[PDB]
Amino acid sequence: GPSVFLFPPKPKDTLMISRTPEVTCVVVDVSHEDPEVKFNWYVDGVEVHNAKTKPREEQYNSTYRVVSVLTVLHQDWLNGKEYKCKVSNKALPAPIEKTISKAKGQPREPQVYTLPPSREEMTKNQVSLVCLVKGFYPSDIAVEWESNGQPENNYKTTPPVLDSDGSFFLYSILTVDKSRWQQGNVFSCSVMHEALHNHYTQKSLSLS
């Protein structure tokens, strides 16, 4: 039948006041015969009406996709506000209900450590700089890399891993040209988590 996904907003969006965090309700496998979908949005029970309604999108075994995006307020989500999407379709026994909300629990700050390139690492054309992060709750986090107030996009970051005490850890590796590193350029590890003063911290790293 028609399946539904309700996605939380990018943690950056929720922690960056200059950005629009949005919850997203995706409906897939809607039929050619019964295409209309009605969305109902609720914030802790109270219905709300501002949601955007995107047009249908061609899919596969003569199907459609429909998405409705609802903006949220930085402080709202952060507070623990529960968001509910209600999907209705003539092909639905009952209307489907999805519930997303920031994880409840006593918040904790991420500890951040940096690892410069090893000796073997330093023989290659491209060296990788590494960033370790632990003891954070909840798992929603954004880690990015910069150098001289410009973004560095050549990195991967592992999903948060559950720790035995309830907090979360991860690592992120940025790869760069050895010359850029040899030149003296500073590279910074930007961590945004709710439990950081102003949501922002940054460890940096250079030779030697």
Partner: peptide
């Protein structure tokens, strides 16, 4: 207290 990320406003206290 305001923090910035790549010139974009993060947060204020």
């Amino acid at each position: 207290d305001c923090a910035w990320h790549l010139g974009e406003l993060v947060w204020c206290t």
